[model samples]
Target: MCMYSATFTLEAITPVFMRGQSKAEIRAASIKGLMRWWFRALSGSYFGNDVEGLRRVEEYVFGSTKRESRVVVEVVKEHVEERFCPLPMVWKKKKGVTTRVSQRAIAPGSKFTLLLTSDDEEVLKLACYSLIGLVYFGGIGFRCSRGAGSLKISSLKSDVQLIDLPKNKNQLGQMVNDLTVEIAKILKKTFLCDHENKNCTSYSSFWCFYLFLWGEKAELEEVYYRSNNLENERLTLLDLFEKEFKNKNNHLASPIKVGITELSEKYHVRVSVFKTKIFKWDNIFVFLENIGAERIYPE
Candidate 1:
């Protein structure tokens, strides 16, 4: 068995809207842009509050450049949709083809790129949130907050396993009651949501929950990639952070210096290397620290 650990720091939290900005108008535009991309990716009707959630982004981007503002909202929508809709249509040989063959491709759903000043930390954070939310849903991305806390969990890279509690209908309520107490340990806050007859019937038995689990940097690194680099003595994620930091402030005085040294020795070479690679390949990072704390699953 392998284990990883790290300290997380909360990064930042800013409202979707800012001073002298029309939150409602910007929000609508943001969600509209978000839905357009989401619908194309899922190949399903994208209608609901989730689309409207881009309003939050709009609120954040008001008065910002049109290109920068629009791309952020669209990227978030893309991340969310991609997480839930990982699979797309496959191409097969047509009658005109001479031989039997198959081809696969990521349907051209949408393009993503931010249009903003690199120095605009707020815009960057919003973009980070979009990517992080996508990672939480898809397990291929990571993020960090301005605060000191952080969080990271391994990406599922597949579908969510919907688990039905209890063996019988009569015991459903009791099973839910029992699970509530146990789930509290894992989830921040949770409750059984009434499934009133509605269009989204499959979610009727769903238990709605929320958890502001540690707000920290989140990253996802592939073990295969990191392990391979360790074998080659290449620079890793921790190495880069420490090396760059130490070199920049080798003469500075701070308690973090000692911690950095310790981290460099224990995790710099392998841990950081893996994380940097993961961020490069899958486009995500573990929350806060370089250690892959949330990546492991219990047997």
Candidate 2:
């Protein structure tokens, strides 16, 4: 058997609402869950009918009832700055009430280390890459896609490399283009499906634009409220997005999701826009450029 070790410094770019009751801390299960979702979305279709491939992926990376997981993750250190309630309790239109529960999170600049090991070298490397991808494209814990639980890898010891945050509009455009191309390449290698078949497109079919906004918590709150309330004549950021792309022949899910990073004096807000179709980078970039938002990934 072979074993490998790597360390990751997880800095919460935004409040991370990890799973727990009143108070929550980082857990291996949360990290594993994110990794599993990313792995399945990125590679599951490619090995759909190959039982051996599926078995290797599950038994080695995730483990099952039949075998122990080849990859193991543990938190070596953690620092939580504070805990509080989320602003503007989200109203569940279906449930007809606003959620009153509060969430706990590790503050920004908090750091943590993870030790990963596997008997198979290939599985170990794959797990490492998937973990990084989860940090980049997704976040940890609940409401991650909405920008909660966002984090960055301050350092990594593995084959996977970290992406720098884009500095300017040109760099952002380039990153978006590159991501689009990469998505296309992934799709070509994997099977493609739509919402009709599985109620949602394959993971490879989705693309994201993470917009870093310069503002404080109040500013974000104003934008959030304005966006959710349509009566205001002035168009909020989300309204602008809907106006720009509403007519496009693509499935746009949650065109605007906002989160705040309260670690710095000049607080930053993260806005994540998602699309179910490929090659929509131009439209997304145009919107960002118009709104003067910065791209935080693919740097």
Candidate 3:
């Protein structure tokens, strides 16, 4: 019998687009792969370019083709609500339509239960943290970088998930501090969350940035459209939004994600930039600061 077990009830804060060979599938490998991505990213601080060490720890935790995984991950759902809609931050309107680009996605309010079981307690701990990274730091499916697969912990019956990784205002801050503390213990590394304006060159958490933009619908709409025009710049953000980010017709990966969620009767905006080759990041920060958006993470 497995010693560590916990069930996570997750609701989609944004659309979740998942596809399989024959039909729709969450693909356990996708979830596990995401966890490993976060795992490797966290371990980078400790390993520090030791490719062999990173792989060693990664394979040990998530396993490889040579062995089964330490944590068995399973996703269960019923009566999923599917919608085909254009992702957030589209190019513009055309002939009385937003944009023809669309993808099959699970609607927001769709809930899924995740079952994670493992015999090793360490595996469970690391898995929980990785899941947090997946939900907070990253998203899933087609436009994850654009914030398609964002999820939040709905209900937890056990402590293995660590008090459900707080989703609200102040709780998110405490969660980051708690995560930093645990990183020191498990990964043998200290996450010095110095809020410096550094470009995200790699998966290392050092360059990661978080913005929790919460406000009324008007403010949220204003914040959403802030990217359209950058002051003192002629090119405009819409060019970057379509050519670089807008998908379907032109599939250039977006360095930034603009995922929105409804919390406490306010629209919460999750704007993140994972990695990018082109950006006027300074203007972005300036705009955000001008709007009084709350900086969420990295103590």
Candidate 4:
């Protein structure tokens, strides 16, 4: 058997409420969920309509009742701090009222480590690639897609090289292409397809843009409130879309989500724009640019 050890830090890009037993901390299950999503997104095309292939690959990496996982994951808690949101309250759409919820999070800059032991080197490589996908394309914990569980890795100890965060739109596109190439090599089939097509969906395929906003935490907080709250004077992205589009049919369920991160005392925000059947990809950029927000990717 071969053993591999990897250590990385998970700086909470947003308030991570990955909880167990009433407190929030990084949980292995959340990481597994992110991995599953990434794996499905990457390998979906190759395993199209092949339920057996789907189950086989998933079970191999994550495990099922019939077999143990080929990869083992663990969370290291050293120097990890638990923090509570100052307000400890948020609006609930489902209830249509302001509700008090437990707001706990693992403080930013917490470190985590994972050890993988497997006789098969191929399985190990795929596992490491999945980790990369989780860090970049996906996130951990509740409302991850909404930015609550976003994390950026500070380093990695495995043999696989880490990809650098893209600085501009050109670099971001290249990085995405590179990752697709690398993941395709392991899956033995290509899944990357046209980003402009209408058939792209989460189950089959997805097209999205990730923006790294240089705005500070206070600015982001104000943006979030004004954008989400109906009583605010400042027009939010949703408001802009509604006003510009005018037609109800053109509106999407939820198109834009934001997450904030603080590193070295500097605040930054990440925004993800989803392209769905109702919302085309081009409109996202048009809306964002018209709203005066900088486009950090796909220039």
Candidate 5:
């Protein structure tokens, strides 16, 4: 009775990621890659066919700037802004140290706390833990590190702000909720726990525990249980969670729909379903099992 649903946005980022390259250079490389795949698929063979018309088209278009670049650049700019906006506030403290932290209820009667520390060592150490969480369990983590220097206690202030994305009005506050989840996942992935030994022992187990709880929150949001069986494909985990959430409050919109619609439109991925059955633990194992990836730590 579990279902899974998700949306994926796929924006071209090569132009920006490789900004030094000229428009023609970027377009050729990208076009070649796309054409290679499409050509091979169309021919139903591994080797090249050198179709006459296709060849002419490729030769003409390869060196020319494709119109897609303008659209891509604009879309990439918007997505990058949305993805990395409100950069983490980094400051140093000469005497007093204040870390940025978040508190969220991870489980019944239990809360999870994440701290963005002032110390580089602490930040690296925490970040390493997040990486281990990803490698070992396919879980996501984030690390917010502060560059050298410090901040004064009096200068530190928390601001209440709202996002101004025109595309997210339909979901209302759920956009903020989804952004929080994505941020946490990114943080857990970017920081290294320790530079000396490439191990994430300090925070792996705890991160796994924390991640699962976050998964639970996601499950609750979708009104679905993470299931090993996919009996009800139509009922995605998000859908089930949304139903349950609605039952509890009757007024709030479903997080499943909010996430699906947003990600689908943004990523050009389909996320139609009612419930999802996969949990955090399952996600980790599935990745490891399929890829033959070993655990990052000895445990």
Candidate 6:
């Protein structure tokens, strides 16, 4: 077997709520599951929305009951500190639980290494791309959509051209756009599809990605409260979705994913909406200006 490995040195920009039995740690299974989702999302561009074919492609890279996966995921932890923080992840008013609660969270700036291995070079590269998609546009762990669990790559050892250590804001943005185009070409297989609203799925960034970058600290702070605070009557965008539209049709979760990462001592929050028809953004535009966010992608 011709084995290949990709090593990533990553730092948490926000609290990572990835929990073990008692402590917070990066769970390999969680990462693999997210990577599998990204793989499936791009498969539609290659296979013309055939779920049957999509499943086969996903299983090819990530494994299934019938076939063994080519890729393997591992997490290497150092003296990474775990602490308890009151994340803005809210819950229903259940048994006097009316506010945010504390859970085991990995402290920001904590360093860790993520390793991915596979015998198939193509599968390995694909897995790496999926990981980029996750940490770049989305994030891992609990309340990632609420801006927790965001990560930034400090360094990388990889063969993929799309994988790199972003040095600045523009670099990271450009990298994301480049990866999007590259994934498009790969999935297109020199073929392409309509990235239309009707085809949008909330779970897939490839479907309808509206990646927004928040400017400065106040913007992050405004969202910190408005995005998840259930007590506010103003009804923020996320609150509106959660209070009214959640689980109406067995829908998974919010189409909006908020990932905040730091670079050059500046914290920037990326608000990515992997859209579904169920979401409304008419009022969201107004909400964004009040909090200071700009759509960096989809431009």
TM-score of each: 0.21, 0.57, 0.70, 0.67, 0.17, 0.75
Residue-wise C-alpha lDDT for candidate 6, range 141-232, written one tens digit per residue: 78777777777777788754544546576676676666656665665553345333344443454555566776555233333334335556
The Cα local distance difference test for each model comes to 0.23, 0.54, 0.58, 0.54, 0.23, 0.65
Model 6 local distance difference test score: 0.65
Per-residue lDDT of candidate 1, residues 1-299 (tens digit):
11111111211111111112332112334433432322221211111223232333444433234334422232121211111111111123446542212122111122223222223443333333333322121111111111101112222111112113233223323433333333222222221322122343111011221111111222222100122122234533432332343343333200011111011112111111111111212222322223232321110
- The segments of candidate 6 whose C-alpha lies over 4 angstroms from its true place after superposition are 18-20, 42-48, 89-100, 163-170, 188-203, 218-253, 278-281
For each candidate in turn, give its C-alpha RMSD to the true structure in angstroms: 21.5, 8.3, 7.3, 6.3, 23.5, 6.1
Model 4 RMSD in angstroms: 6.3
Number of the top-ranking candidate, with TM-score as the measure: 6
Q: State candidate 4's TM-score.
A: 0.67
- Runs of candidate 2 exceeding 4 Å displacement: 44-56, 85-103, 159-299
- Relative to the true structure, candidate 1 reaches a TM of 0.21
Worst 10 residues of 4 by lDDT: 190-199
Candidate 4 residues 1-299, lDDT tens each? Answer: 55654555555544566544766656776677667666765554345434456677888877889978877767754456787642212444645544334356765556566554455566666666667656655567666655556666665666445446554445654665555556556666423432223334533322343454434443334322224333445754323333343443332424555554434444454455545443346655665555456555544
Cα lDDT for residue 257, candidate 1:
10
What lDDT score goes with residue 89 in model 5? Answer: 25
Stretches of candidate 5 exceeding 4 Å from the true structure: 1-54, 60-299
Instruction: List, residue by residue over 10-87, the lDDT tens digit for candidate 3.
Output: 777666776425344466678888888877665544454345656766787798889677887888544468876445
lDDT for 209 in candidate 4 is 36
